[PDB]
Design a protein around this ligand. Structure first.
Ligand SMILES: O=C(O)[C@@H]1C[C@]2(C(=O)O)C=C[C@@H](O)[C@@H](C2)O1
Ligand SMILES: N[C@@H](Cc1c[nH]c2ccccc12)C(=O)O
Ligand SMILES: N[C@@H](Cc1c[nH]c2ccccc12)C(=O)O
Ligand SMILES: [Mn+2]
Ligand SMILES: [Mn+2]
Ligand SMILES: [Mn+2]
Lengths: 457, 83, 444, 444
């Protein structure tokens, strides 16, 4: 009864988090806009008291799913627009991308024989990095809709802190609709498979997919034949993500969250998952150090100059407590470098005891500028990077964790190849991307079938 | 009956044809792999999608329903299973 | 003893073929004993089967029925019952994937103790074996004597077998994932495993898709197996009659010796006992028809046996021979469909394809069994009607009774391990092989 | 059969009390027959029961065991079995609501055919009725002869009973909402319905709350009933031993005449057959302890019957009489808990409270049956230990065997419908009342 006495009396910014923050705020930050510090601060104070885009418990749930991906028990599908725009942040467009991702995910689930975690580039992807600050004419470059406008005028191209507020509005409108669609029938497994059969039936390359597709259909009819109810099959979770880029916006969305135990964590609640770009990943700079002090799952893009030593060093900075799926390493190497560079990256990282998600981004290392002056990517080069990624993983015995692709559910003419045989002269028909060339609906579905076979092997 | 002698003679023909198919499948496979080794030694892709789809649709026009399946076997033997 | 007594009186006053010649007074006392014993099945189970069988007849499900040709008391053991149950369940998984519909699983078990014969003819031990519910297998006068007390023994064995079927199916034997692992072992070990490889892998990708989709379920752990047998013996079947009242208050007469009961090719006289008995019980029932049946005889059976036009109530079991199914069945099907009845069309590819080999063993060629089921699917696809089910005789033992299949059983192999107390059965391998081939028929 | 064989020879080399004197060569023929028959239960079931019984002993579940004092072949009928099954399930739903835990439901059934007698013979030299597995109720020289063939009859009857129990519990008799409607018509019809009104209304509100929360579940349509009986007769029990091999590859020896077996108060010598047989088998075991037990004697049983310290493995069944339960049990509990075994503590409030009334009939007063369970709960609450379950003899028929209850049965009433072939049973009403009161005890 010493515990009887105690129980009656006991009845009747924090710590070094502020250290790490000021250290992080001190650091150099690549790819930032030049705008008034006073204006920027006033906007940050507004955004500090608004509702976040996601809540912390959603982020703790994603973390358990990403751990399953890392441990070999699930696959990650990430993708969407290269860059969202406020003009294109519309119901029909968001719906087109959500459907497309959900459609790709059913095929991939069947081929992976594992759950697929569905992560959209959405509800925040409004900042893009640029090589120079000015155009050929001394006109400030478009830096995404959170900084300036697309229109090639000096008014439009001015860097405007208030666009952070427009971006937050558009992002929450967008996440709102993503949540509504996925809970009200758009994420229905059977409706989704009806849309995939139409894809196969109407494709000029349908004969390439019909057999895998008949197989999936027999798998679905089987489920129902075995007396399996509607239950989990009527809805699904889509997670938002974007490049953590604009310092003022990402700091303004930092939130404290306290969990089941009473444990207190710092989250960037502008998205479930955030990533660090190729051009913003200096180990001594803001972005890498910011991701290292937020609790959100994190991605990092690595190009073909990456060395294994550098890979290990990031893994140590970003996953310091050895948490599976905390860190996703996003290999974007080019189709001709992937087989050469990645093996040694994976080996050093695996040997160092980190269990990261290994993800292929077959888009950003396979971009070229065609005769007619259009930035484009060839379907075959995109497929071959992914295919090379899988070959490396099969050779090493490691897990091909996921893909990250830029696509839209719109019938655009942005990337060459696929079943429609899109060539140089087709590109100006319907090129709508505000940044990089995206796979169209047809190319996205083709890729899901092909990556399904990669998984099946 | 007498039909057993005819069937046994038709079956030996099927055997000779199955040998032909198989020998030619083998040879085709050898050549498809060389093209892949030649293209990949030059910094090209393992697969060429429009070339696969063309062969696949070509086979369907020729033999119907099973054409894509037949073609699929040749493509898989020749450039490997995907992944 | 309701105002339906007039129907009953009419039934028992009818001639019945294929009965024993035993002491009727003693038989009557065995009936009175069995009138008070617990039934083999309860009426709510029968009502549940009847909704499932309506699903089959309406094109939304498929009926798998099978097991020993003749059960025996000697063979009514845990290992033997478990083997047949496993085999039936394994077959059902593959058929479910092929049909894209649920499979209703019906076992020839817990009652299949009576068999028909030409006419109890022999030289020295004159009385032929009529099944363990009448007499014994040994060819002596003492064993072959028709003994009413075997109805009590039959019931005791039926009880124990059904108890065990129920225990196996609720405790893990009918788990979908365990069953698929056994199918994987079949494919891996068959000399014909490469025939089945592709479909087997597909089924597995299907199962793994269920799990990947978040589906755990109680439906996947367990399964229903219904019992059935030929209602042949008058004294036993009438003694297992029971009245049952529904939730709606309807009093109904069931023969609760089994979920489902069928009438043989040799006992289906319209004016005789068995057809009339089947007419007044509420269990779903089936009727065997051979190659001699006419479309008008099929319609008359349907009128008498499905008088309230209840889909699934009647199952018409074509046992026509591989060489006659294609020519005889189309007309039968056309006529019954037009008369407005919705029966389950079921193929029994065994009883029309039996012959005796040069070494004297009754056998069946696997190809002729397959070809009959094949032909039956051909007839159905031509007419656009529903291939409803199969009825096959098999066992989960490595017996040498039917010719063919992957292991290439020939006449010289037959005497090695022939263990049927009656017709030759498919062995475990041939059974699972046929399951795959019928899956393909279902997929077309 | 290597480590086991040593232990089996030791078990069968020991005295067994309460056996019949019959021709041993006959008994041995009967054992060889029963060694080939399908068991009453299968090993995976017993493994499942043991997980559930582990939950009971760890304080996360409650054991409800009960049924006839003594089954007879005469009484082994659909109505009688359904009646007891219904009552057991109805009791279980009320107890589940009171406990806020699952109730494991265990019927005295499918083998409670043997009873211990004090004198082998009576004062006029006639052998006593030892149960339908040994001899007949009819008091003649012929009917009282010890007949080993009755072992086969017991097996056949047990098979049938257990077959039916499984059928009823899978086909709607165990549906939660149907059971609650029967409870509702009990409360509405009892002379003491007003005693139970509030609690019944609370349960119904709870049921309708699940439905309102959108709980659609097959969990609520069916339930598992495990069989049990006193493992008394050496020959029947050893002939139902079976080796079962596990999922991970272990060989265990089970007695598969029941899921659970217990050792009676008159057969629990440490040096004797029954305790040593119970030590050998891997079924969960119960042991009856009476007022003369010592804490040391109780710990010696726990060491021997639960050698591997497996929670739920042993159930200690206190049958002490209401007047002694508060004195004797506390010390027994402390000793066994301190010895590190986690047993199920169960009350048998029946066998310690029997007496012969003025008119000659044996009976029990409802109040004394209640007071023992009440006292058992008081002892548990004081010590901070878990009341694990109850063991009660009852039938779902309107008998006049026990005094008291809402209907105030007295001496004069006992001759009306006294039907038990051994001890006085609670009738339907008394059983349903007891469930409500024990639910309040569970609620405190
Ligand atoms: O480029 C090619 O022609 C070769 C041959 C190939 C085939 O096997 O037919 C066809 C297309 C390509 O994917 C592969 C396989 O390379
Ligand atoms: N909810 C399950 C199954 C499912 C429902 N809708 C989906 C859309 C795509 C992929 C899977 C699904 C899952 O997401 O895994
Ligand atoms: N109970 C489900 C699924 C299932 C479990 N075990 C089976 C065995 C065979 C076929 C199906 C099953 C059904 O019968 O539909
Ligand atoms: Mn891009
Ligand atoms: Mn037969
Ligand atoms: Mn008793």
């Amino acid at each position: 009864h010493h515990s009887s006495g105690m129980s009656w009396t006991v009845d009747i910014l924090p710590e070094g988090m502020q250290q790490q923050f000021e250290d992080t705020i001190s650091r150099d930050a690549k790819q930032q806009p030049t705008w008034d510090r006073a204006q920027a601060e006033n906007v940050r104070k507004i955004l500090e008291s608004v509702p976040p885009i996601v809540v912390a418990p959603e982020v703790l749930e994603l973390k358990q799913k990403l751990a399953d991906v890392a441990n070999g028990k699930a696959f990650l599908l990430q993708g969407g627009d290269c860059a969202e725009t406020f003009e294109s942040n519309t119901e029909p467009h968001i719906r087109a991308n959500v459907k497309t991702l959900l459609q790709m995910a059913v095929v991939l689930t069947y081929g992976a024989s594992t759950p697929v975690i569905k992560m959209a580039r959405i509800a925040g992807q409004y900042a893009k990095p640029r090589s120079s600050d000015l155009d050929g004419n001394g006109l400030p470059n478009y830096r995404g809709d959170i900084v300036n406008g697309v229109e090639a005028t000096p008014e439009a191209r001015r860097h405007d802190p208030a666009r952070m507020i427009r971006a937050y509005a558009n992002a929450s409108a967008a996440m709102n609709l993503v949540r509504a669609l996925t809970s009200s029938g758009t994420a229905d497994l059977y409706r989704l498979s009806e849309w995939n059969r139409e894809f196969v039936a109407n494709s000029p390359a349908g004969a390439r997919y019909e057999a895998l597709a008949r197989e999936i259909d027999s798998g679905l009819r089987f489920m129902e034949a075995c007396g399996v109810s509607d239950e989990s099959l009527r809805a699904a979770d889509i997670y938002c993500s974007h490049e953590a880029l604009l310092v003022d916006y990402e700091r303004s969305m930092l939130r404290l969250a306290t969990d089941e135990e009473g444990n207190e964590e710092l989250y960037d609640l502008s998205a479930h998952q955030l990533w660090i770009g190729e051009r913003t990943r200096g180990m001594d700079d803001f972005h890498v150090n910011f991701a290292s002090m937020i609790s959100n799952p994190i991605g990092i893009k690595i190009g073909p100059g990456i060395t294994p030593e550098e890979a290990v060093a990031y893994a140590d900075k970003l996953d310091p407590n050895f948490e599976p799926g905390r860190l996703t390493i996003v290999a974007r190497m080019g189709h001709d470098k992937v087989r050469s560079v990645l093996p040694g990256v994976i080996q050093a990282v695996e040997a160092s005891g980190h269990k990261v998600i290994w993800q292929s981004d077959p888009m950003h290392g396979n971009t070229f500028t065609a005769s007619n002056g259009y930035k484009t990517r060839h379907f075959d080069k995109v497929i071959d990077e992914v295919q090379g990624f899988f070959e490396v993983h099969r050779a090493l015995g490691t897990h091909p964790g996921g893909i990250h692709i830029e696509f839209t559910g719109e019938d655009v003419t942005e990337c060459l190849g696929g079943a429609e045989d899109i060539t140089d002269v087709d590109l100006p028909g319907r090129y709508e991307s505000a940044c990089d060339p995206r796979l169209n609906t047809q190319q996205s579905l083709e890729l899901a079938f092909l990556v399904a076979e990669m998984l099946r092997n | 009956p007498l039909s057993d002698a005819e069937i046994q003679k038709y079956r030996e023909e099927i055997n000779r044809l199955d040998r032909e198919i198989l020998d030619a499948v083998k040879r085709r496979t050898k050549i498809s792999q060389t093209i892949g080794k030649t293209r990949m030694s030059s910094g090209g892709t393992r697969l060429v999608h429009t070339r696969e789809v063309a062969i696949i649709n070509q086979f369907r026009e020729e033999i119907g329903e099973e054409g894509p399946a037949l073609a699929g076997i040749l493509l898989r033997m020749g450039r490997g299973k995907l992944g």
